[PDB]
Ligand SMILES: [Cl-]
Ligand SMILES: [Cl-]
Ligand SMILES: [Cl-]
Ligand SMILES: [Cl-]
Ligand SMILES: [Cl-]
Ligand SMILES: [Cl-]
Ligand SMILES: [Zn+2]
Ligand SMILES: [Zn+2]
Ligand SMILES: [Zn+2]
Ligand SMILES: [Zn+2]
Ligand SMILES: [Zn+2]
Ligand SMILES: [Zn+2]
Ligand SMILES: [Zn+2]
Ligand SMILES: [Zn+2]
C-alpha cells in the first residue's frame with residue numbers, strides 16, 4: 738500500500754478499511770495483529786493468543802498504529818498460518834461501475 | 840438494501856459507503872441525487888444540473904438524508920441515463936478471503 742493512504746474506519750468490529758490511490762483494503766484486525774506479534778515473537782501460538790479478536794471495537798489511535806505497522810511488516814500479505822490478511826478491491830472497479838473514469 | 844443498515848461515510852468525496860447484513864454498497868452521490876430529483880421533477884436535465892457533483896464534501900446529515908431517500912426510490916438501481924447508482928460487494932467475499940465464515 739502506498740505511503741499516502743486514508744483510513745476509513747472499522748467494519749463489523751472485524752476489518753479496518755484503508756485505501757491508497759489504487760485499492761481499498763479490508764484488513765483483518767486479528768490477522769494483522771497476529772502477524773505483527775509473530776514478526777516480533779517468532780511464536781505462532783503466542784502471537785495468536787495475545788492478539789485482538791474479531792468483534793472487539795478498536796480506538797482510532799489503535800487503528801492508526803496497526804495500519805502504520807502493517808506497511809513495515811516483512812510479510813504484510815498473509816498471517817503465519819497462510820491466511821490472507823486483507824481483501825482488496827481496485828478502486829477502478831467501483832468508479833467504472835458507475836460510469837466514471839479512474 | 841435492508842432497512843437495518845450502517846453508513847460508513849464518504850469516499851473520495853464521490854461515494855457514500857453503506858452496508859446491510861448482505862452487501863457493502865458504494866453509492867454515487869451525484870447519481871443518487873440525480874435519481875431523487877428526477878423522480879420528483881420528471882426532468883432529466885434539470886435533475887442533473889441541480890444535483891451535487893463528485894468532489895463535494897457532504898455533511899453527515901445530508902448523507903443520512905440521501906441514503907434514507909435512496910431506499911424509497913422507485914428505481915434505486917440506475918440513474919435516468921442508465922448508469923448504475925452504486926457498486927456492491929457481497930460481504931461474504933471479504934470475510935471468505937481472510938478465512939472467516941459469513
Ligand atoms: Cl478472531
Ligand atoms: Cl497518531
Ligand atoms: Cl499511530
Ligand atoms: Cl459528478
Ligand atoms: Cl437524522
Ligand atoms: Cl435523515
Ligand atoms: Zn508457543
Ligand atoms: Zn490460534
Ligand atoms: Zn489466530
Ligand atoms: Zn499514533
Ligand atoms: Zn493466523
Ligand atoms: Zn429540462
Ligand atoms: Zn448532465
Ligand atoms: Zn448527471
Ligand SMILES: [Zn+2]
Nearest residue numbers: 900901903904
Ligand atoms: Zn436527518
Ligand SMILES: [Zn+2]
Nearest residue numbers: 873918919920
Ligand atoms: Zn445520469
